[PDB]
């Protein structure tokens, strides 16, 4: 009923897991019934009475809709706030958190559409999670890299390259100034290139580029696989090769597998780059699904050192979950999609990874928008350079460092960006060539 | 079309792909640390780059640590006094690389490192 | 009094709290003895971090009625000092050093407020009363 | 009764474990009854008769109070001597020795206070223990260090440092002349610094300092953990890194875990530095508890290569258990707290570790009091040097070696100490700077 | 404020942070061994310090052993005769480090080692 599950005078406990749903009720369903239904069908709802309820105190196990209000978003949409008791969730299990909250309610007939927008993860629950294998600061210390965004490149063509030609592209990108190169999310082990061959040639490229430049280099070696045994086998060989970073598609691989890999990476000193493949199946539409900030919080709990975070070329929403991924304490700010004040009680942060159509002219905006604690990934922005991968990497490293220098001097990146880039073009023929084509 | 050099341009992380900074450019980078309430400190080494002599497990490298020149300059308000220690370091160790690093007591970490002198 | 006697500090829900029965040496005020219990059981390299984030602080002192020169010192330890799931480290952190401090003639740890945030990192009893029955 | 357990004409056997208790009886309890009660309630005492005693010969399993005498210590205190048969104790188990002797008797109502002062560990029992993984002489040979106290520094701030900044302090201390740096006893694995990150950066510091100076360097990497599995995992990674020494808080970790770690260290060539965290909970008060010399004997049996032994800035008591920790044969000497002649039948000795407020001016007294077979730990005595950690280490190494030279020449350290230090200040600007502030 | 050198002051364990000993200071250290009934012995090497070439397991280092100069000087009563072998060693191997070590038959161990000559 309503007053069992719609409890608008409920005061949330500091141990509650809070959820903010964007609910679109069916026509004729009043908001208080939709709100009670979201809480009931995501906890203790039953269509008929059962005698076993007399063996316990169910009110201690129900979810409660303690607030619902219309949103200015589209037809007949509301935000329903739900509180879930701490005892419902298995410790250290993102899998059980998702199952418990989003496992059933999205299919209820009286709800025409439903989207989970945010979760308040209390310290009593988040402390049962390891979190990132290392996190932002440990990664900077391990790589000896400070004071600028990190730089990466996605190797293309995505599929069709031999393992050796893959590693050849990686070496040329790394030697030009990029910190990382990247296995495509689709690149696991395939007839055109088997994973162990790729790991071998990519390791040779990492170490050749590192010896030539004197800076620590990496390549996200994708350990995503069809079974947890294959996944760990690929991480084990990366450990043997002694490389700094591996990679996992956490949504398609799954949280149970991802949490196991994060535990391995912590146990063996490997950084974990996380790709969000298939996220748009879930997080694209405003009316139904789960916003990416929910999937971003879940990755930080399950474990990852990087996570892909999209582009800026909507910005304030992106800045919202960047803060949720990086910071220790994030104040409530619904204008940026932050529906709950989030305290991570010293769980390490995740480096967001910007990627999508980014080239050299975007470097001022990216450095200003994300700050130093990010990775800027280039696709054709490096490989499409007319002089090749190493000059393309040099153009991106030069463009970035000219932005960092100007920002450090107190200059305004959002307004002086084009002139900062043009000025750097004067002493970098590599950067000039990139700016002539883009 | 130019070929990116394979020798003579070994690097020192942030700002080492820029041209050598002037003394005014160098002071501006120091003032950035001070305005940010970060503590500057000098580091020096005759070996410029990382290597892997003692171990090759993930995340282990040798040559990340350099040697501290004196102490972090807590309470510094004069960027030129950092420049004054840089010249002291270069006079005592002309054959050493010298980089300027920064510590934040708030983030509780090192968060800055850029080259300030290379031997000829 | 020192940077360790903070009599109006509001405990956090994540703090581990301790109640010590402190017997100061002759000539040691209870305020000074209480600050020493917080300091000796917690805290140029200091400029590379924030010590107030990692100090234990004595936030309350009261006398023991019926015993002369006996006081209860309440100390708050931040959550970040303790390794998850390790009673060994909780004992090491809180009782590892302070009982030997010369300014304290005697010291007895009477109680510990184990915050739910810390206790949830422990498996606890293999079964417990109800499972066993 | 008295004559079952108070047996003043008993002649102790060479297989007996002997105990010396400082007993404070309740008012009205005569000393012979207190003595019988200490023996009875630490062996075969029963409040009612049981028929099962007829199935054995209990006199062969009882403890016997064979002597009791008043002590000049405080009100109504006595020393009760108890003999325990060898068959009572599990071989190789300090845990069972403590359980058997101190497990129950301290709570007996008729005893207002009780303190175990000493134990006579017979060769027939001590030979069932491995003892120190290496011991004083093996350690000197492994490190190629002879003829002077070893030098260490406790890294501060105790908590709050990042793993890399921790290792940076370690490198600067080691490169200046110290043999060791030290994980704090509280430093295990915490949100501010996870143990594997610390081991990595501390290993880099060890090897950078060793390569720069040409002397073997170490850092006590703390393996103390919440489970024996975590403890061994940390020792295993130190073994992989190839470093010389790890560390354990033997009292808070416990003797069962400590004996397992000592066995691992012997099996893998690791030195074991032992911290005595929480000892003052037990050993501070004269009237109740267990004196540190008992806990020191137990550590030597369970296993450790160093043990923290306090300061001298009471000395004769400290010198007593230093001898009990280091020597092969220690004659009875109650003025120094040695209640029993102790024969270790070639079980290796433990290097005592002096620590607490020690600075350069104390180097003559420390070298004279402890001799060469010690470790001198500095806190602010190194890190508080006005020129930094490396000059602070140099000041301590210079001060120590000037003391060793003067002592070797036959000079009197207890009387000429200040002039030996002042004379060394003349050619060591590093030492002079330390002596100007302290 | 002085910066502790990073080169030119490599060390040889006990007494190597002192200034170079005079011949009288050196004899006093030798007399300490004799008065202690310890047997002096000379050791020499053209490589001064430890390294890890054959293994890196805990407690394994190369370069701890040097080469024995002749034999331990059992029954020595004249500290100058140790000095006489030191000069012999330096004349035969001017390019070798020479250290004086000591053995005790009672502790059954080596318990002394200090540098006595470095090549220029």
């Amino acid at each position: 009923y309503k007053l069992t599950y719609y409890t608008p005078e409920y005061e949330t406990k500091d141990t509650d897991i809070l959820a903010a749903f964007r609910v679109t009720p069916q026509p004729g369903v009043p908001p208080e019934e939709a709100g009670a239904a979201v809480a009931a069908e995501s906890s203790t709802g039953t269509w008929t009475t059962v005698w076993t309820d007399g063996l316990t105190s169910l009110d201690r196990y129900k979810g409660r809709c303690y607030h619902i209000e219309p949103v200015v978003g589209e037809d007949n949409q509301y935000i329903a706030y739900v509180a879930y008791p701490l005892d419902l969730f298995e410790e250290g299990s993102v899998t059980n958190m998702f199952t418990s909250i989003v496992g059933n309610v999205f299919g209820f007939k009286a709800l025409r559409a439903l989207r989970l927008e945010d979760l308040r993860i209390p310290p009593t629950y988040s402390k049962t999670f390891q979190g990132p294998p290392h996190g932002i600061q440990v990664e900077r210390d391990k790589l000896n890299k400070y004071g600028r965004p990190l730089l990466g490149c996605t190797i293309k063509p995505k599929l069709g390259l031999s393992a050796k030609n893959y590693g050849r592209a990686c070496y040329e990108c790394l030697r030009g100034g990029l910190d990382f190169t990247k296995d495509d999310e689709n690149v696991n082990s395939q007839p055109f290139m088997r994973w162990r061959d790729r790991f071998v040639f990519c390791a040779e490229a990492i170490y050749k580029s590192q010896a030539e430049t004197g800076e620590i280099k990496g390549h996200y070696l994708n350990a995503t696989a069809g079974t947890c045994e294959e996944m760990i086998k690929r991480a084990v060989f990366a450990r043997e090769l002694g490389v700094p970073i591996v990679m996992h598609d956490y949504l398609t691989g799954g949280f149970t597998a991802n949490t196991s890999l994060a535990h391995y990476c912590r146990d063996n000193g490997l950084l974990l780059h996380i790709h969000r493949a298939m996220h748009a199946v879930i997080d694209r539409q405003k009316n139904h699904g789960m916003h990416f900030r929910v999937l971003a919080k879940a990755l930080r709990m399950s474990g990852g050192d990087h996570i892909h975070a999209g582009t800026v070329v909507e910005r304030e929403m992106t800045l919202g979950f960047v803060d949720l991924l990086r910071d220790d304490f994030i104040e409530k700010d619904r204008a940026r999609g932050i529906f709950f004040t989030q305290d991570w009680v010293s769980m390490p942060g995740v480096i967001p990874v910007a990627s999508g159509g980014i080239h050299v002219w975007h470097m001022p905006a990216l450095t200003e928008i994300f700050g130093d604690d990010s990775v800027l990934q280039f696709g054709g922005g490096t490989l499409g350079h007319p002089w090749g991968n190493a000059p393309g990497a040099a153009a991106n490293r030069v463009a970035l460092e000219a932005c960092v220098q100007a920002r450090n001097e107190g200059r305004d990146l959002a307004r002086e960006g084009n002139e900062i880039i043009r000025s750097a073009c004067k002493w970098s023929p590599e950067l000039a060539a990139a700016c002539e084509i883009w | 079309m130019q070929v990116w050099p394979i020798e003579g341009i070994k690097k020192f992380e942030t700002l080492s792909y820029l041209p050598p900074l002037t003394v005014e450019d160098l002071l501006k980078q120091i003032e950035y640390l001070l305005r940010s309430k970060w503590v500057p400190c000098l580091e020096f080494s005759k070996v410029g780059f990382v290597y892997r002599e003692n171990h090759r497990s993930p995340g282990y490298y040798d040559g990340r640590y350099w040697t501290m020149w004196k102490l972090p300059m807590f309470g510094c308000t004069d960027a030129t006094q950092v420049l004054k220690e840089l010249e002291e370091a270069k006079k005592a160790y002309p054959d050493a690389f010298v980089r300027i690093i920064g510590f934040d007591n708030v983030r509780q970490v090192q968060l800055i490192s850029f080259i300030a002198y290379k031997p000829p």
Side-chain angles (χ1 to χ4, degrees), chain A, chain B:
Chain A
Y1 215 74
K2 266 176 177 176
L3 292 194
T4 36
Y5 295 99
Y6 180 60
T7 63
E9 305 320 294
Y10 176 75
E11 283 142 331
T12 63
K13 310 182 187 70
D14 297 335
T15 57
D16 283 340
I17 301 198
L18 307 178
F21 288 91
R22 178 186 305 263
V23 188
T24 304
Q26 293 281 17
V29 171
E32 296 81 21
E33 177 168 68
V38 174
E41 307 303 317
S42 66
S43 58
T44 48
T46 56
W47 70 271
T48 197
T49 74
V50 297
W51 64 269
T52 43
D53 286 2
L55 307 177
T56 191
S57 299
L58 257 206
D59 289 310
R60 304 176 71 85
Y61 295 91
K62 67 178 175 182
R64 284 162 179 110
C65 174
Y66 61 94
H67 187 71
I68 184 167
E69 54 181 53
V71 278
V72 201
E74 319 195 289
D75 68 314
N76 194 38
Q77 284 184 1
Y78 305 79
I79 299 300
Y81 291 80
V82 186
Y84 298 97
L86 169 72
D87 275 12
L88 299 190
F89 307 90
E90 170 157 16
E91 299 90 346
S93 181
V94 169
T95 291
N96 184 245
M97 190 187 63
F98 274 25
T99 308
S100 297
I101 297 178
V102 313
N104 179 75
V105 64
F106 287 70
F108 198 60
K109 312 310 198 318
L111 312 178
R112 200 181 70 170
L114 185 63
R115 196 202 197 189
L116 180 59
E117 290 280 2
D118 203 1
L119 289 170
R120 199 285 300 270
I121 313 299
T124 43
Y125 193 51
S126 68
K127 267 297 254 199
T128 73
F129 292 77
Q130 168 204 99
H134 299 92
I136 303 178
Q137 177 56 227
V138 174
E139 171 162 359
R140 286 197 169 283
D141 287 339
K142 290 281 184 66
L143 307 176
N144 200 29
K145 295 178 191 282
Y146 307 95
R148 73 174 165 82
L150 304 178
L151 290 176
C153 176
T154 324
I155 300 306
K156 302 222 250 190
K158 165 174 308 235
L159 325 164
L161 278 196
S162 65
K164 174 179 173 164
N165 286 5
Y166 210 83
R168 163 178 278 113
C170 160
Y171 157 65
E172 296 285 342
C173 297
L174 291 171
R175 89 183 193 83
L178 300 179
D179 306 294
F180 308 109
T181 46
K182 175 206 161 209
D183 271 357
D184 192 86
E185 60 272 14
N186 299 357
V187 168
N188 296 352
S189 190
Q190 278 102 346
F192 50 84
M193 167 177 48
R194 295 295 173 191
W195 71 266
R196 209 192 180 282
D197 296 328
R198 177 173 77 259
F199 282 33
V200 165
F201 287 107
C202 279
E204 184 186 346
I206 290 171
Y207 293 134
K208 186 189 180 66
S209 57
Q210 177 173 296
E212 171 183 322
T213 68
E215 304 182 335
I216 296 169
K217 301 299 188 176
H219 174 92
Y220 321 146
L221 289 162
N222 204 342
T224 309
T227 63
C228 309
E229 292 81 11
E230 265 306 297
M231 180 191 73
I232 293 291
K233 174 193 301 178
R234 296 167 193 194
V236 161
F237 185 50
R239 207 276 202 211
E240 182 190 341
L241 293 165
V243 297
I245 189 158
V246 292
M247 164 181 180
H248 192 228
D249 315 329
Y250 81 116
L251 290 183
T252 53
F255 283 114
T256 294
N258 189 79
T259 311
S260 285
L261 181 59
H263 284 176
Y264 180 88
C265 288
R266 161 78 60 92
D267 281 343
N268 290 277
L270 288 158
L271 296 161
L272 180 51
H273 172 91
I274 293 297
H275 193 276
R276 54 175 201 173
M278 97 162 291
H279 74 104
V281 172
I282 294 166
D283 68 18
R284 173 106 186 234
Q285 299 300 326
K286 198 99 179 185
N287 68 331
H288 193 95
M290 307 166 77
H291 193 278
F292 179 63
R293 74 181 70 89
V294 171
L295 311 170
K297 287 196 176 181
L299 189 273
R300 189 168 172 186
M301 294 161 64
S302 159
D305 293 317
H306 306 170
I307 187 171
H308 277 246
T311 40
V312 307
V313 316
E314 191 241 28
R315 155 154 68 264
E316 289 289 311
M317 292 305 185
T318 298
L319 286 187
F321 64 73
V322 164
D323 286 354
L324 295 170
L325 280 160
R326 293 201 305 218
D327 294 354
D328 188 60
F329 188 88
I330 302 95
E331 286 185 18
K332 178 167 168 173
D333 188 344
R334 278 163 292 176
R336 306 190 305 152
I338 300 155
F339 289 77
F340 303 102
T341 291
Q342 182 58 68
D343 190 354
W344 290 108
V345 287
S346 284
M347 179 184 286
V350 183
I351 305 187
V353 176
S355 97
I358 284 300
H359 40 85
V360 287
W361 289 110
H362 302 123
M363 212 74 81
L366 296 174
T367 307
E368 176 74 11
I369 290 161
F370 285 95
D372 281 349
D373 286 348
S374 60
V375 185
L376 308 181
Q377 290 281 154
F378 300 89
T382 299
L383 318 171
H385 191 283
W387 297 358
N389 292 353
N396 283 306
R397 180 74 177 262
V398 164
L400 173 64
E401 294 201 341
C403 284
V404 165
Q405 177 190 33
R407 177 208 62 203
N408 290 358
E409 298 180 356
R411 299 182 64 188
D412 194 347
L413 271 39
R415 280 71 184 252
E416 299 171 64
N418 289 336
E419 277 326 305
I420 294 159
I421 299 291
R422 283 194 191 99
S423 167
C425 277
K426 267 62 198 74
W427 49 259
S428 166
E430 289 74 22
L431 180 54
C435 288
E436 288 277 1
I437 78 155
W438 298 303
Chain B
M1 190 177 325
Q2 303 181 5
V3 182
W4 192 245
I6 57 170
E7 298 195 326
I9 53 161
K10 294 231 235 186
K11 295 304 187 187
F12 306 88
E13 284 301 338
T14 301
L15 303 190
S16 62
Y17 279 70
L18 306 180
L21 297 182
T22 65
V23 168
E24 310 83 79
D25 298 326
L26 198 61
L27 284 172
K28 286 185 182 177
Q29 296 302 311
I30 297 159
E31 296 280 11
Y32 168 64
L33 272 70
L34 299 177
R35 287 199 322 270
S36 299
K37 302 311 271 175
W38 302 330
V39 176
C41 183
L42 272 62
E43 242 185 339
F44 70 106
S45 180
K46 303 239 306 202
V47 173
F49 319 99
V50 303
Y51 55 105
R52 314 191 85 184
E53 156 180 319
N54 294 105
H55 207 239
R56 294 178 187 277
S57 53
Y60 186 93
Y61 305 85
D62 296 297
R64 293 175 293 195
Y65 288 131
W66 283 6
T67 304
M68 189 172 325
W69 175 265
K70 290 177 179 186
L71 276 180
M73 304 176 72
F74 306 99
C76 179
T77 59
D78 192 351
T80 77
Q81 288 284 137
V82 176
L83 211 83
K84 285 181 180 197
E85 299 293 339
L86 171 60
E87 297 305 313
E88 276 185 55
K90 291 156 39 168
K91 181 82 179 191
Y93 293 94
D95 52 346
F97 308 89
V98 178
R99 68 191 175 195
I100 289 165
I101 64 180
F103 297 95
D104 182 17
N105 74 306
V106 174
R107 275 152 220 165
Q108 308 177 3
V109 305
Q110 170 176 8
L111 43 62
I112 291 282
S113 179
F114 62 96
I115 191 63
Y117 170 81
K118 322 181 198 184

